[PDB]
Design an enzyme around this catalytic site. Structure first.
Site, PDB file in Angstrom:
ATOM      1  N   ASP A  19       0.883  -1.232   0.181  1.00  0.00           N
ATOM      2  CA  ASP A  19       0.033  -0.024  -0.078  1.00  0.00           C
ATOM      3  C   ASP A  19       0.990   1.227   0.198  1.00  0.00           C
ATOM      4  OD1 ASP A  19      -1.960  -1.775   0.315  1.00  0.00           O
ATOM      5  OD2 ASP A  19      -2.457  -1.210   2.443  1.00  0.00           O
ATOM      6  N   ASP A  53      12.975  -8.142  19.228  1.00  0.00           N
ATOM      7  CA  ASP A  53      11.942  -8.506  20.341  1.00  0.00           C
ATOM      8  C   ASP A  53      10.646  -8.070  19.734  1.00  0.00           C
ATOM      9  OD1 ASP A  53      14.179  -6.412  22.218  1.00  0.00           O
ATOM     10  OD2 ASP A  53      13.810  -8.405  22.693  1.00  0.00           O
ATOM     11  N   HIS A  63      -3.756 -15.570  10.287  1.00  0.00           N
ATOM     12  CA  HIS A  63      -2.290 -15.435   9.967  1.00  0.00           C
ATOM     13  C   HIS A  63      -1.650 -16.281  11.049  1.00  0.00           C
ATOM     14  CE1 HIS A  63      -3.960 -12.132  12.048  1.00  0.00           C
ATOM     15  NE2 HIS A  63      -2.639 -11.859  12.895  1.00  0.00           N
ATOM     16  N   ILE A  75     -11.367  -4.385  12.813  1.00  0.00           N
ATOM     17  CA  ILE A  75     -10.180  -4.525  13.219  1.00  0.00           C
ATOM     18  C   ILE A  75      -8.843  -3.842  12.406  1.00  0.00           C
ATOM     19  CG2 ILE A  75      -8.016  -5.969  14.276  1.00  0.00           C
ATOM     20  CD1 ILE A  75     -10.819  -5.627  15.938  1.00  0.00           C
ATOM     21  N   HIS A  78      -3.212  -5.543  15.558  1.00  0.00           N
ATOM     22  CA  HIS A  78      -3.227  -6.221  16.958  1.00  0.00           C
ATOM     23  C   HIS A  78      -1.763  -6.421  17.105  1.00  0.00           C
ATOM     24  CE1 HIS A  78      -2.503 -10.518  16.745  1.00  0.00           C
ATOM     25  NE2 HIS A  78      -2.798  -9.898  15.532  1.00  0.00           N
ATOM     26  N   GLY A  85       9.062 -14.909  22.181  1.00  0.00           N
ATOM     27  CA  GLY A  85       8.552 -15.334  21.173  1.00  0.00           C
ATOM     28  C   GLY A  85       7.499 -14.312  20.460  1.00  0.00           C
ATOM     29  N   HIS A 113      -0.290   3.230  18.474  1.00  0.00           N
ATOM     30  CA  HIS A 113      -1.218   2.739  19.341  1.00  0.00           C
ATOM     31  C   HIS A 113      -0.716   1.176  19.487  1.00  0.00           C
ATOM     32  CE1 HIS A 113      -5.268   1.817  21.230  1.00  0.00           C
ATOM     33  NE2 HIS A 113      -5.104   0.716  20.754  1.00  0.00           N
ATOM     34  N   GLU A 114      -0.383   0.564  18.684  1.00  0.00           N
ATOM     35  CA  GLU A 114      -0.013  -1.012  18.617  1.00  0.00           C
ATOM     36  C   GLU A 114       1.034  -0.997  19.401  1.00  0.00           C
ATOM     37  OE1 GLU A 114      -3.484  -1.880  17.233  1.00  0.00           O
ATOM     38  OE2 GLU A 114      -2.147  -3.224  18.341  1.00  0.00           O
ATOM     39  N   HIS A 117       0.882  -1.234  23.140  1.00  0.00           N
ATOM     40  CA  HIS A 117       0.491  -2.584  23.609  1.00  0.00           C
ATOM     41  C   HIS A 117       1.608  -3.560  23.761  1.00  0.00           C
ATOM     42  CE1 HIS A 117      -3.664  -1.957  23.767  1.00  0.00           C
ATOM     43  NE2 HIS A 117      -4.063  -1.719  22.443  1.00  0.00           N
ATOM     44  N   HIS A 123      -5.928   0.307  27.660  1.00  0.00           N
ATOM     45  CA  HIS A 123      -6.601   1.119  26.905  1.00  0.00           C
ATOM     46  C   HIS A 123      -6.816   2.470  27.843  1.00  0.00           C
ATOM     47  CE1 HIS A 123      -7.789  -1.412  23.385  1.00  0.00           C
ATOM     48  NE2 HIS A 123      -6.794  -0.730  23.022  1.00  0.00           N
TER      49      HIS A 123
HETATM   50  C1  LIG Z   1      -7.716  -7.235  18.293  1.00  0.00           C
HETATM   51  C2  LIG Z   1      -8.123  -5.814  18.202  1.00  0.00           C
HETATM   52  C3  LIG Z   1      -9.575  -6.022  18.685  1.00  0.00           C
HETATM   53  C4  LIG Z   1      -7.589  -5.028  19.157  1.00  0.00           C
HETATM   54  C5  LIG Z   1      -6.706  -3.682  18.587  1.00  0.00           C
HETATM   55  N1  LIG Z   1      -7.688  -3.073  17.644  1.00  0.00           N
HETATM   56  S1  LIG Z   1      -8.045  -1.923  16.475  1.00  0.00           S
HETATM   57  O1  LIG Z   1      -7.608  -2.403  15.284  1.00  0.00           O
HETATM   58  O2  LIG Z   1      -9.437  -1.899  16.671  1.00  0.00           O
HETATM   59  C6  LIG Z   1      -7.511  -0.147  16.957  1.00  0.00           C
HETATM   60  C7  LIG Z   1      -6.275   0.136  16.453  1.00  0.00           C
HETATM   61  C8  LIG Z   1      -5.851   1.560  16.686  1.00  0.00           C
HETATM   62  C9  LIG Z   1      -6.461   2.243  17.444  1.00  0.00           C
HETATM   63  C10 LIG Z   1      -6.051   3.537  17.774  1.00  0.00           C
HETATM   64  C11 LIG Z   1      -6.814   4.379  18.884  1.00  0.00           C
HETATM   65  C12 LIG Z   1      -6.522   5.679  19.036  1.00  0.00           C
HETATM   66  C13 LIG Z   1      -5.479   6.203  18.278  1.00  0.00           C
HETATM   67  C14 LIG Z   1      -4.820   5.649  17.279  1.00  0.00           C
HETATM   68  C15 LIG Z   1      -5.141   4.149  17.109  1.00  0.00           C
HETATM   69  C16 LIG Z   1      -7.548   1.706  18.231  1.00  0.00           C
HETATM   70  C17 LIG Z   1      -8.121   0.378  17.957  1.00  0.00           C
HETATM   71  C18 LIG Z   1      -6.322  -2.707  19.388  1.00  0.00           C
HETATM   72  O3  LIG Z   1      -6.997  -2.322  20.403  1.00  0.00           O
HETATM   73  O4  LIG Z   1      -5.095  -2.387  19.425  1.00  0.00           O
HETATM   74 CA   LIG Z   2      -3.406  -3.190   1.696  1.00  0.00          CA
HETATM   75 CA   LIG Z   3      -9.596  -5.310   9.324  1.00  0.00          CA
HETATM   76 CA   LIG Z   4       8.466 -11.070  20.013  1.00  0.00          CA
HETATM   77 ZN   LIG Z   5      -1.873 -11.613  14.487  1.00  0.00          ZN
HETATM   78 ZN   LIG Z   6      -5.532  -0.968  21.514  1.00  0.00          ZN
END
Ligand SMILES: CC(C)C[C@@H](NS(=O)(=O)c1ccc(-c2ccccc2)cc1)C(=O)O
Ligand SMILES: [Ca+2]
Ligand SMILES: [Ca+2]
Ligand SMILES: [Ca+2]
Ligand SMILES: [Zn+2]
Ligand SMILES: [Zn+2]
Length: 158
Positions: A19, A53, A63, A75, A78, A85, A113-114, A117, A123
């Site tokens: 992309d 890491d 996947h 989604i 994540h 691992g 955001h990711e 995590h 959150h």
């Molecule tokens: C396995 C999923 C249900 C969890 C995942 N989901 S998400 O793709 O919905 C996602 C991604 C980015 C955000 C985000 C929120 C605020 C600012 C930037 C990104 C929020 C949710 C997440 O919360 O990271």
């Molecule tokens: Ca794509």
């Molecule tokens: Ca999707």
């Molecule tokens: Ca790892």
């Molecule tokens: Zn995955």
């Molecule tokens: Zn999240």
């Protein structure tokens, strides 16, 4: 929850979304790690071989983990919490359209955001926080962590 017990953290981009331009993928992820190293003692380095890491993956549908993607929308990505691992690893849904800008889904903002995590952050209920559970686009050339994000990461590191 778990946190990384070390200051030098490595990452590796497993594969590239078609992309975007390759150098833009590299830059978006780099800038996103920088957001978090700005406010902690962590140092992030990109390696091109061996085990990192944090493995960065683009994938669609099923996947090889238990967090199948769902096609375009819903989604976007994540990530796994700190640990061995697959721990730390951050997966991005290839059925989204990743960009450097306001169109499609912004890879930089998603990655910030990711990577929260991947570092063990949960959150926030504040709609201004990057760790708010629902994606919301803000201009990336002026992006800044909310004060809630900073207190969250600083509760974990530093
Ligand atoms: C396995 C999923 C249900 C969890 C995942 N989901 S998400 O793709 O919905 C996602 C991604 C980015 C955000 C985000 C929120 C605020 C600012 C930037 C990104 C929020 C949710 C997440 O919360 O990271
Ligand atoms: Ca794509
Ligand atoms: Ca999707
Ligand atoms: Ca790892
Ligand atoms: Zn995955
Ligand atoms: Zn999240």
């Amino acid at each position: 929850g778990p946190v990384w017990r070390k200051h030098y953290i490595t990452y590796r981009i497993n594969n590239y979304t078609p992309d975007m331009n390759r150098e833009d993928v590299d830059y978006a992820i780099r800038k996103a790690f920088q957001v978090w190293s700005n406010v902690t003692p962590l140092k992030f380095s990109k390696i091109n071989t061996g085990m990192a890491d944090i493995l960065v993956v683009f994938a669609r549908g099923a996947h090889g983990d238990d967090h199948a993607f769902d096609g375009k929308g819903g989604i976007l990505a994540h990530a796994f919490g700190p640990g061995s691992g697959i721990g730390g690893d951050a997966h991005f849904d290839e059925d989204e359209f990743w960009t450097t800008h306001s169109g499609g889904t912004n890879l930089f903002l998603t990655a910030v955001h990711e990577i929260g995590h991947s570092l063990g952050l949960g959150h926030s209920s504040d709609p201004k926080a990057v760790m708010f559970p629902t994606y919301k686009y803000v201009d990336i050339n002026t992006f800044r962590l909310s004060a809630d994000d900073i207190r969250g990461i600083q509760s974990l590191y530093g």
